[PDB]
């Protein structure tokens, strides 16, 4: 249920370095990138959305900002190393995930704010930001990163999880009583690793009796462990 | 070696762990029809079950793989080795391997070097979490002592496996005590059932406590064979510290 | 619909029409104008543009107005009629070529062209035979024009392009024959080919029309018959391996794959170029097996075999990856051959590779060809014949007179 | 470090008349950044030496942009700027050979103009000896007329809590003026000379759109001038009208400035 969304943002992120007749001759030049976020998070939803660009390209993955609090306040020097290696590696895509005394955090946050904007740098590489919740971070990080467009994670539109379930079950063996509407409709805010996890434990639970085919009662019986586990804490 | 003839009492937990550990061993073809990946590992929190390592060395002994620990409790600390890449190179060369820390199971220096080991395994979990050289590389935690708080706190059961292990099967008290009685010279008129079932409440370490604390009375009387009265005194000798 | 929903900018005629010089960038302008058909400004930019260029530019500019008018039979007639019965040879010969290109089902221009072709020694009807027979062959088992081309095959004029457009004309006329044919026409040109073993360009462009006549076979043993009579000194054996190029259209024949790997070490450095060049035609569907380690060797000719064997498909990143290493080379043969397939297999990544060509280059051949690729950078036999006949560009500039009238484009 | 490759400034950028409301101050600094180079003999004959420079501090505003503007409006050869955030780093001691090699290149450039940015990253003396070597060696290599004492003195900082530069600046620095934050009617010239892009409809009044965006830095109004043509071409149109993106303007300043 996000094919038009993934092709809209896909065109919004593929216009640099590809299809140049409508990128530099007409004068688009969005040299700032986009900012993403997911309510479930886990990195697998945003990784499954940005994974379309990882097919034929160079990718860089930096998850979390723990490398600043775990050591002394060295500052944004590591971001400067990523900046010079991004300049030496222009044909790439910058992606940061899990973006989460006080006088130093504010000055390195303002220095990271001006550094991320790139006042002395033109369009050379695309930067995409990602975090758990956009409300926890300060809204000052919006103007440098997100200047083109932002998108939020949709609802269980019964087509996204149906297409993903079809891809994961393109070669699996399922019984005829295994309906889909109750599954894609009953779930709410579950990533691909959750449906893949319940399918994995469903096939592993059906393997206990050498049954190569998974029934619906065993699928929901395996789902009871995840539904019970998420509500226990 | 510590094969199945030296460990018993966890039939349900080995029946449940053969799909976590034994899955990439003899049946790896389920990757298409199931879609499973390599998890972080598994751990057993609670009292010491008198064989917490014999199980890892047992499954590792039946998998026909090497056992390379991190802390190096027995002359295996500097034999392999910034002392962080050599373990990953030996893990690349030896694809089947089981990692289990035993020595780790002052607050100023001990948590300093111990915090360096914790940072070592954290960055190793970052390298193995980012990329992967070969399969059959799994780590197992040990939460049996009191000073184990980082492994129990950082592994709540969200992206890892958790097993409630206070009452394993009552065989951690009975039948592995029988196994610990098979190694030493055992008589034929002993009844380990009552003396093994009448040790509740204190802990799960009743096996090692009654054996090691009974060796002082078998060493005092110098009896060629261990009697049931020795274990009966060992029950009190281990319940006095409670 | 193309005039209504699409509109091209004038910056192509402005730039490519502004940096013309050295009588070769003007040839590139005859490629742009020749294959442009929305805009017809450069056509109506006065006169003398045809006279400023060379003779091959007179053919290219005389045929451009015919290649841009594949519509409005009366308009193409009232536009090409001016160049007809002119004073120059290439204006009227390129005018008859234009009359052959403007249409393919009118066939009313046959009588004024064929009526004067019978000269047999030297006359304007030889170039009018190039354009008339070539365009008439593009318009079309036609027996009358072939029995009239029989004295042309028997003539064997000094200009190779006579038998070039004749053998390619009747060949494209005879593509798709049921199990081929062993008729006395191509048997006659095989006998005349065996008569004298001179001017090997005959032994290069005649197997083109022969193999085009053998096209459409399903169980023809004509390749084995050629392996019986034709087998001789390696010129006619090269004709035989051209029949082998037109003998393996595709089936379950792994014996030709192991025999292909066994014959990959042949001493003759041309039957590997053609017989190995057939790879792009044989396995044109299963493209997963086409990429190999042919480039890692030292036989740059094989690097050209893969360079041409890339094709004209959607152009996956593997093909362009081969164009990255094949692009940088010192000899003008490979450097001139790489942009053709580079822009044929990618027809929107077109501007950055041209900037790479400007960074590597900055002779005249690479400039005319790089402007050509600047233009055209943006399973029928009609689209397979022109480039397979274009595989003989590493020769005199006489081929450039026929390069501008390729029909492989739409 | 990155200060060697990032030190050289090129690729000209935003021009003179995009100053943030400064009408008198643009002459107070133009008379030292542009006038001495345009009339070298007029200051030698008409006086004794050209002026030293100015000093801009206080509120950030459109800082760090006007010096790049001075690089853009250079008539002979764009000068080199120096940032201060790269001096305070691990393994101290390289700042001596660094300032000696950049001042050595300054002597190689017939005593060209040398701008110094972000003095607060090495300032504020109030274990800090490693900083005192860099800042006291720097001031020693600026007040000291041996390399050159006439080119330019300017410090664009945000925090004025630098004790030592505040007492050493009366030696060679001068013009202790404020930043002169942009007023309401300042942006109309930014729109006037920023109208040199694709053909903009004359219906867009520059005074209205200029007065409908308060508290907007130079980079912010530059991003608005970029998003005007951005959101003007995203609709596959050929002309830009304020009615097409007024919601994008008052939203991009209001929703992003609440």
PDB file of N, CA and C in Angstrom, chain C residues 228-306:
ATOM      1  N   UNK C 228      30.918 -28.325 -47.484  1.00  0.00           N
ATOM      2  CA  UNK C 228      31.401 -29.281 -48.476  1.00  0.00           C
ATOM      3  C   UNK C 228      32.057 -28.584 -49.664  1.00  0.00           C
ATOM      4  N   UNK C 229      31.349 -27.643 -50.293  1.00  0.00           N
ATOM      5  CA  UNK C 229      31.881 -26.994 -51.487  1.00  0.00           C
ATOM      6  C   UNK C 229      32.698 -25.750 -51.152  1.00  0.00           C
ATOM      7  N   UNK C 230      32.248 -24.962 -50.174  1.00  0.00           N
ATOM      8  CA  UNK C 230      32.845 -23.650 -49.940  1.00  0.00           C
ATOM      9  C   UNK C 230      34.203 -23.770 -49.250  1.00  0.00           C
ATOM     10  N   UNK C 231      34.443 -24.868 -48.525  1.00  0.00           N
ATOM     11  CA  UNK C 231      35.678 -24.999 -47.758  1.00  0.00           C
ATOM     12  C   UNK C 231      36.886 -24.891 -48.680  1.00  0.00           C
ATOM     13  N   UNK C 232      37.661 -23.832 -48.491  1.00  0.00           N
ATOM     14  CA  UNK C 232      38.852 -23.552 -49.285  1.00  0.00           C
ATOM     15  C   UNK C 232      39.797 -22.724 -48.419  1.00  0.00           C
ATOM     16  N   UNK C 233      40.729 -22.020 -49.066  1.00  0.00           N
ATOM     17  CA  UNK C 233      41.614 -21.048 -48.429  1.00  0.00           C
ATOM     18  C   UNK C 233      40.821 -20.128 -47.502  1.00  0.00           C
ATOM     19  N   UNK C 234      41.439 -19.603 -46.427  1.00  0.00           N
ATOM     20  CA  UNK C 234      40.652 -19.047 -45.312  1.00  0.00           C
ATOM     21  C   UNK C 234      39.786 -17.837 -45.638  1.00  0.00           C
ATOM     22  N   UNK C 235      39.811 -17.348 -46.879  1.00  0.00           N
ATOM     23  CA  UNK C 235      38.886 -16.284 -47.260  1.00  0.00           C
ATOM     24  C   UNK C 235      37.474 -16.834 -47.429  1.00  0.00           C
ATOM     25  N   UNK C 236      37.313 -17.827 -48.304  1.00  0.00           N
ATOM     26  CA  UNK C 236      36.023 -18.483 -48.456  1.00  0.00           C
ATOM     27  C   UNK C 236      35.690 -19.375 -47.269  1.00  0.00           C
ATOM     28  N   UNK C 237      36.696 -19.784 -46.492  1.00  0.00           N
ATOM     29  CA  UNK C 237      36.419 -20.421 -45.210  1.00  0.00           C
ATOM     30  C   UNK C 237      35.915 -19.405 -44.195  1.00  0.00           C
ATOM     31  N   UNK C 238      36.342 -18.145 -44.323  1.00  0.00           N
ATOM     32  CA  UNK C 238      35.753 -17.076 -43.527  1.00  0.00           C
ATOM     33  C   UNK C 238      34.327 -16.784 -43.975  1.00  0.00           C
ATOM     34  N   UNK C 239      34.049 -16.913 -45.274  1.00  0.00           N
ATOM     35  CA  UNK C 239      32.662 -16.882 -45.726  1.00  0.00           C
ATOM     36  C   UNK C 239      31.874 -18.041 -45.128  1.00  0.00           C
ATOM     37  N   UNK C 240      32.505 -19.214 -45.022  1.00  0.00           N
ATOM     38  CA  UNK C 240      31.834 -20.371 -44.441  1.00  0.00           C
ATOM     39  C   UNK C 240      31.531 -20.153 -42.964  1.00  0.00           C
ATOM     40  N   UNK C 241      32.458 -19.539 -42.225  1.00  0.00           N
ATOM     41  CA  UNK C 241      32.189 -19.245 -40.823  1.00  0.00           C
ATOM     42  C   UNK C 241      31.222 -18.080 -40.658  1.00  0.00           C
ATOM     43  N   UNK C 242      31.056 -17.246 -41.689  1.00  0.00           N
ATOM     44  CA  UNK C 242      29.954 -16.289 -41.681  1.00  0.00           C
ATOM     45  C   UNK C 242      28.620 -17.000 -41.872  1.00  0.00           C
ATOM     46  N   UNK C 243      28.590 -18.021 -42.732  1.00  0.00           N
ATOM     47  CA  UNK C 243      27.415 -18.884 -42.809  1.00  0.00           C
ATOM     48  C   UNK C 243      27.174 -19.562 -41.467  1.00  0.00           C
ATOM     49  N   UNK C 244      28.247 -19.873 -40.735  1.00  0.00           N
ATOM     50  CA  UNK C 244      28.094 -20.399 -39.383  1.00  0.00           C
ATOM     51  C   UNK C 244      27.541 -19.341 -38.436  1.00  0.00           C
ATOM     52  N   UNK C 245      27.865 -18.067 -38.672  1.00  0.00           N
ATOM     53  CA  UNK C 245      27.250 -16.994 -37.898  1.00  0.00           C
ATOM     54  C   UNK C 245      25.755 -16.934 -38.176  1.00  0.00           C
ATOM     55  N   UNK C 246      25.362 -17.120 -39.437  1.00  0.00           N
ATOM     56  CA  UNK C 246      23.955 -17.178 -39.815  1.00  0.00           C
ATOM     57  C   UNK C 246      23.432 -18.610 -39.875  1.00  0.00           C
ATOM     58  N   UNK C 247      23.976 -19.501 -39.041  1.00  0.00           N
ATOM     59  CA  UNK C 247      23.561 -20.897 -39.018  1.00  0.00           C
ATOM     60  C   UNK C 247      23.179 -21.411 -37.637  1.00  0.00           C
ATOM     61  N   UNK C 248      23.296 -20.599 -36.589  1.00  0.00           N
ATOM     62  CA  UNK C 248      23.060 -21.008 -35.206  1.00  0.00           C
ATOM     63  C   UNK C 248      22.128 -20.022 -34.513  1.00  0.00           C
ATOM     64  N   UNK C 249      20.974 -19.759 -35.137  1.00  0.00           N
ATOM     65  CA  UNK C 249      20.017 -18.793 -34.603  1.00  0.00           C
ATOM     66  C   UNK C 249      19.608 -19.094 -33.165  1.00  0.00           C
ATOM     67  N   UNK C 250      19.676 -20.352 -32.738  1.00  0.00           N
ATOM     68  CA  UNK C 250      19.425 -20.683 -31.348  1.00  0.00           C
ATOM     69  C   UNK C 250      18.584 -21.924 -31.131  1.00  0.00           C
ATOM     70  N   UNK C 251      19.098 -22.839 -30.316  1.00  0.00           N
ATOM     71  CA  UNK C 251      18.415 -24.074 -29.945  1.00  0.00           C
ATOM     72  C   UNK C 251      19.164 -24.672 -28.760  1.00  0.00           C
ATOM     73  N   UNK C 252      18.868 -25.931 -28.443  1.00  0.00           N
ATOM     74  CA  UNK C 252      19.674 -26.635 -27.466  1.00  0.00           C
ATOM     75  C   UNK C 252      20.850 -27.295 -28.151  1.00  0.00           C
ATOM     76  N   UNK C 253      21.985 -26.603 -28.163  1.00  0.00           N
ATOM     77  CA  UNK C 253      23.149 -27.002 -28.947  1.00  0.00           C
ATOM     78  C   UNK C 253      24.433 -26.765 -28.156  1.00  0.00           C
ATOM     79  N   UNK C 254      24.459 -27.228 -26.904  1.00  0.00           N
ATOM     80  CA  UNK C 254      25.604 -27.056 -26.011  1.00  0.00           C
ATOM     81  C   UNK C 254      26.880 -27.567 -26.676  1.00  0.00           C
ATOM     82  N   UNK C 255      26.725 -28.442 -27.674  1.00  0.00           N
ATOM     83  CA  UNK C 255      27.868 -28.885 -28.465  1.00  0.00           C
ATOM     84  C   UNK C 255      28.570 -27.711 -29.139  1.00  0.00           C
ATOM     85  N   UNK C 256      27.831 -26.654 -29.483  1.00  0.00           N
ATOM     86  CA  UNK C 256      28.458 -25.452 -30.016  1.00  0.00           C
ATOM     87  C   UNK C 256      29.053 -24.574 -28.924  1.00  0.00           C
ATOM     88  N   UNK C 257      28.718 -24.826 -27.662  1.00  0.00           N
ATOM     89  CA  UNK C 257      29.327 -24.098 -26.555  1.00  0.00           C
ATOM     90  C   UNK C 257      30.651 -24.728 -26.150  1.00  0.00           C
ATOM     91  N   UNK C 258      30.695 -26.059 -26.045  1.00  0.00           N
ATOM     92  CA  UNK C 258      31.969 -26.723 -25.794  1.00  0.00           C
ATOM     93  C   UNK C 258      32.867 -26.680 -27.025  1.00  0.00           C
ATOM     94  N   UNK C 259      32.285 -26.820 -28.219  1.00  0.00           N
ATOM     95  CA  UNK C 259      33.052 -26.627 -29.444  1.00  0.00           C
ATOM     96  C   UNK C 259      33.446 -25.167 -29.621  1.00  0.00           C
ATOM     97  N   UNK C 260      32.643 -24.244 -29.084  1.00  0.00           N
ATOM     98  CA  UNK C 260      33.009 -22.832 -29.116  1.00  0.00           C
ATOM     99  C   UNK C 260      34.206 -22.556 -28.215  1.00  0.00           C
ATOM    100  N   UNK C 261      34.197 -23.110 -27.000  1.00  0.00           N
ATOM    101  CA  UNK C 261      35.345 -22.958 -26.113  1.00  0.00           C
ATOM    102  C   UNK C 261      36.568 -23.688 -26.651  1.00  0.00           C
ATOM    103  N   UNK C 262      36.362 -24.761 -27.418  1.00  0.00           N
ATOM    104  CA  UNK C 262      37.492 -25.462 -28.021  1.00  0.00           C
ATOM    105  C   UNK C 262      38.067 -24.677 -29.194  1.00  0.00           C
ATOM    106  N   UNK C 263      37.208 -23.980 -29.948  1.00  0.00           N
ATOM    107  CA  UNK C 263      37.654 -23.194 -31.094  1.00  0.00           C
ATOM    108  C   UNK C 263      38.013 -21.765 -30.709  1.00  0.00           C
ATOM    109  N   UNK C 264      37.893 -21.405 -29.429  1.00  0.00           N
ATOM    110  CA  UNK C 264      38.186 -20.043 -28.995  1.00  0.00           C
ATOM    111  C   UNK C 264      39.658 -19.681 -29.160  1.00  0.00           C
ATOM    112  N   UNK C 265      40.532 -20.664 -29.368  1.00  0.00           N
ATOM    113  CA  UNK C 265      41.967 -20.432 -29.521  1.00  0.00           C
ATOM    114  C   UNK C 265      42.417 -20.558 -30.972  1.00  0.00           C
ATOM    115  N   UNK C 266      41.590 -20.121 -31.918  1.00  0.00           N
ATOM    116  CA  UNK C 266      41.950 -20.206 -33.326  1.00  0.00           C
ATOM    117  C   UNK C 266      42.985 -19.145 -33.681  1.00  0.00           C
ATOM    118  N   UNK C 267      43.885 -19.491 -34.605  1.00  0.00           N
ATOM    119  CA  UNK C 267      44.929 -18.553 -35.007  1.00  0.00           C
ATOM    120  C   UNK C 267      44.362 -17.411 -35.843  1.00  0.00           C
ATOM    121  N   UNK C 268      43.378 -17.701 -36.692  1.00  0.00           N
ATOM    122  CA  UNK C 268      42.786 -16.685 -37.559  1.00  0.00           C
ATOM    123  C   UNK C 268      42.027 -15.676 -36.704  1.00  0.00           C
ATOM    124  N   UNK C 269      42.469 -14.417 -36.732  1.00  0.00           N
ATOM    125  CA  UNK C 269      41.974 -13.385 -35.829  1.00  0.00           C
ATOM    126  C   UNK C 269      40.770 -12.628 -36.382  1.00  0.00           C
ATOM    127  N   UNK C 270      40.024 -13.221 -37.308  1.00  0.00           N
ATOM    128  CA  UNK C 270      38.800 -12.610 -37.816  1.00  0.00           C
ATOM    129  C   UNK C 270      37.585 -13.513 -37.679  1.00  0.00           C
ATOM    130  N   UNK C 271      37.738 -14.816 -37.935  1.00  0.00           N
ATOM    131  CA  UNK C 271      36.647 -15.750 -37.693  1.00  0.00           C
ATOM    132  C   UNK C 271      36.302 -15.848 -36.214  1.00  0.00           C
ATOM    133  N   UNK C 272      37.240 -15.503 -35.328  1.00  0.00           N
ATOM    134  CA  UNK C 272      36.897 -15.341 -33.921  1.00  0.00           C
ATOM    135  C   UNK C 272      36.092 -14.068 -33.700  1.00  0.00           C
ATOM    136  N   UNK C 273      36.394 -13.012 -34.461  1.00  0.00           N
ATOM    137  CA  UNK C 273      35.665 -11.758 -34.305  1.00  0.00           C
ATOM    138  C   UNK C 273      34.217 -11.897 -34.755  1.00  0.00           C
ATOM    139  N   UNK C 274      33.984 -12.564 -35.885  1.00  0.00           N
ATOM    140  CA  UNK C 274      32.621 -12.734 -36.379  1.00  0.00           C
ATOM    141  C   UNK C 274      31.915 -13.914 -35.716  1.00  0.00           C
ATOM    142  N   UNK C 275      32.542 -15.094 -35.743  1.00  0.00           N
ATOM    143  CA  UNK C 275      31.937 -16.275 -35.136  1.00  0.00           C
ATOM    144  C   UNK C 275      31.733 -16.093 -33.638  1.00  0.00           C
ATOM    145  N   UNK C 276      32.655 -15.402 -32.967  1.00  0.00           N
ATOM    146  CA  UNK C 276      32.459 -15.057 -31.566  1.00  0.00           C
ATOM    147  C   UNK C 276      31.572 -13.832 -31.394  1.00  0.00           C
ATOM    148  N   UNK C 277      31.507 -12.959 -32.404  1.00  0.00           N
ATOM    149  CA  UNK C 277      30.561 -11.851 -32.373  1.00  0.00           C
ATOM    150  C   UNK C 277      29.119 -12.334 -32.453  1.00  0.00           C
ATOM    151  N   UNK C 278      28.892 -13.540 -32.982  1.00  0.00           N
ATOM    152  CA  UNK C 278      27.551 -14.111 -33.033  1.00  0.00           C
ATOM    153  C   UNK C 278      26.967 -14.376 -31.648  1.00  0.00           C
ATOM    154  N   UNK C 279      27.764 -14.223 -30.585  1.00  0.00           N
ATOM    155  CA  UNK C 279      27.274 -14.494 -29.237  1.00  0.00           C
ATOM    156  C   UNK C 279      26.075 -13.619 -28.889  1.00  0.00           C
ATOM    157  N   UNK C 280      26.112 -12.341 -29.272  1.00  0.00           N
ATOM    158  CA  UNK C 280      25.011 -11.442 -28.946  1.00  0.00           C
ATOM    159  C   UNK C 280      23.731 -11.796 -29.692  1.00  0.00           C
ATOM    160  N   UNK C 281      23.828 -12.542 -30.791  1.00  0.00           N
ATOM    161  CA  UNK C 281      22.647 -12.968 -31.531  1.00  0.00           C
ATOM    162  C   UNK C 281      22.143 -14.337 -31.095  1.00  0.00           C
ATOM    163  N   UNK C 282      23.045 -15.240 -30.708  1.00  0.00           N
ATOM    164  CA  UNK C 282      22.641 -16.595 -30.345  1.00  0.00           C
ATOM    165  C   UNK C 282      21.951 -16.627 -28.985  1.00  0.00           C
ATOM    166  N   UNK C 283      22.621 -16.122 -27.951  1.00  0.00           N
ATOM    167  CA  UNK C 283      22.096 -16.118 -26.586  1.00  0.00           C
ATOM    168  C   UNK C 283      21.504 -14.766 -26.206  1.00  0.00           C
ATOM    169  N   UNK C 284      20.831 -14.104 -27.152  1.00  0.00           N
ATOM    170  CA  UNK C 284      20.299 -12.766 -26.910  1.00  0.00           C
ATOM    171  C   UNK C 284      19.224 -12.738 -25.829  1.00  0.00           C
ATOM    172  N   UNK C 285      18.648 -13.886 -25.474  1.00  0.00           N
ATOM    173  CA  UNK C 285      17.591 -13.941 -24.467  1.00  0.00           C
ATOM    174  C   UNK C 285      18.149 -14.199 -23.071  1.00  0.00           C
ATOM    175  N   UNK C 286      18.868 -15.305 -22.892  1.00  0.00           N
ATOM    176  CA  UNK C 286      19.479 -15.636 -21.605  1.00  0.00           C
ATOM    177  C   UNK C 286      20.736 -14.793 -21.436  1.00  0.00           C
ATOM    178  N   UNK C 287      20.562 -13.600 -20.870  1.00  0.00           N
ATOM    179  CA  UNK C 287      21.658 -12.660 -20.684  1.00  0.00           C
ATOM    180  C   UNK C 287      22.489 -12.945 -19.441  1.00  0.00           C
ATOM    181  N   UNK C 288      22.103 -13.932 -18.631  1.00  0.00           N
ATOM    182  CA  UNK C 288      22.873 -14.246 -17.431  1.00  0.00           C
ATOM    183  C   UNK C 288      24.192 -14.929 -17.773  1.00  0.00           C
ATOM    184  N   UNK C 289      24.243 -15.652 -18.890  1.00  0.00           N
ATOM    185  CA  UNK C 289      25.449 -16.355 -19.309  1.00  0.00           C
ATOM    186  C   UNK C 289      26.369 -15.499 -20.171  1.00  0.00           C
ATOM    187  N   UNK C 290      25.876 -14.383 -20.706  1.00  0.00           N
ATOM    188  CA  UNK C 290      26.694 -13.567 -21.599  1.00  0.00           C
ATOM    189  C   UNK C 290      27.925 -12.960 -20.929  1.00  0.00           C
ATOM    190  N   UNK C 291      27.858 -12.387 -19.722  1.00  0.00           N
ATOM    191  CA  UNK C 291      29.081 -11.847 -19.109  1.00  0.00           C
ATOM    192  C   UNK C 291      30.060 -12.959 -18.762  1.00  0.00           C
ATOM    193  N   UNK C 292      31.312 -12.779 -19.171  1.00  0.00           N
ATOM    194  CA  UNK C 292      32.366 -13.750 -18.914  1.00  0.00           C
ATOM    195  C   UNK C 292      33.663 -12.992 -18.653  1.00  0.00           C
ATOM    196  N   UNK C 293      34.776 -13.728 -18.621  1.00  0.00           N
ATOM    197  CA  UNK C 293      36.097 -13.159 -18.389  1.00  0.00           C
ATOM    198  C   UNK C 293      36.853 -12.902 -19.688  1.00  0.00           C
ATOM    199  N   UNK C 294      36.135 -12.568 -20.763  1.00  0.00           N
ATOM    200  CA  UNK C 294      36.789 -12.316 -22.044  1.00  0.00           C
ATOM    201  C   UNK C 294      37.653 -11.062 -22.003  1.00  0.00           C
ATOM    202  N   UNK C 295      37.303 -10.094 -21.154  1.00  0.00           N
ATOM    203  CA  UNK C 295      38.063  -8.857 -21.099  1.00  0.00           C
ATOM    204  C   UNK C 295      39.391  -8.989 -20.382  1.00  0.00           C
ATOM    205  N   UNK C 296      39.510  -9.966 -19.483  1.00  0.00           N
ATOM    206  CA  UNK C 296      40.723 -10.141 -18.693  1.00  0.00           C
ATOM    207  C   UNK C 296      41.883 -10.724 -19.490  1.00  0.00           C
ATOM    208  N   UNK C 297      41.664 -11.106 -20.745  1.00  0.00           N
ATOM    209  CA  UNK C 297      42.725 -11.650 -21.580  1.00  0.00           C
ATOM    210  C   UNK C 297      43.507 -10.506 -22.227  1.00  0.00           C
ATOM    211  N   UNK C 298      44.367 -10.843 -23.188  1.00  0.00           N
ATOM    212  CA  UNK C 298      45.154  -9.856 -23.914  1.00  0.00           C
ATOM    213  C   UNK C 298      44.678  -9.649 -25.344  1.00  0.00           C
ATOM    214  N   UNK C 299      43.702 -10.426 -25.803  1.00  0.00           N
ATOM    215  CA  UNK C 299      43.161 -10.293 -27.139  1.00  0.00           C
ATOM    216  C   UNK C 299      42.148  -9.172 -27.250  1.00  0.00           C
ATOM    217  N   UNK C 300      42.637  -7.934 -27.381  1.00  0.00           N
ATOM    218  CA  UNK C 300      41.768  -6.756 -27.458  1.00  0.00           C
ATOM    219  C   UNK C 300      40.667  -6.931 -28.497  1.00  0.00           C
ATOM    220  N   UNK C 301      40.912  -7.743 -29.529  1.00  0.00           N
ATOM    221  CA  UNK C 301      39.853  -8.062 -30.482  1.00  0.00           C
ATOM    222  C   UNK C 301      38.676  -8.738 -29.789  1.00  0.00           C
ATOM    223  N   UNK C 302      38.956  -9.593 -28.802  1.00  0.00           N
ATOM    224  CA  UNK C 302      37.881 -10.219 -28.035  1.00  0.00           C
ATOM    225  C   UNK C 302      37.200  -9.188 -27.144  1.00  0.00           C
ATOM    226  N   UNK C 303      37.968  -8.222 -26.634  1.00  0.00           N
ATOM    227  CA  UNK C 303      37.367  -7.109 -25.907  1.00  0.00           C
ATOM    228  C   UNK C 303      36.398  -6.334 -26.790  1.00  0.00           C
ATOM    229  N   UNK C 304      36.692  -6.240 -28.090  1.00  0.00           N
ATOM    230  CA  UNK C 304      35.723  -5.685 -29.018  1.00  0.00           C
ATOM    231  C   UNK C 304      34.577  -6.632 -29.307  1.00  0.00           C
ATOM    232  N   UNK C 305      34.820  -7.941 -29.193  1.00  0.00           N
ATOM    233  CA  UNK C 305      33.749  -8.915 -29.382  1.00  0.00           C
ATOM    234  C   UNK C 305      32.705  -8.775 -28.284  1.00  0.00           C
ATOM    235  N   UNK C 306      33.147  -8.597 -27.037  1.00  0.00           N
ATOM    236  CA  UNK C 306      32.204  -8.332 -25.956  1.00  0.00           C
ATOM    237  C   UNK C 306      31.657  -6.912 -26.040  1.00  0.00           C
TER     238      UNK C 306
END
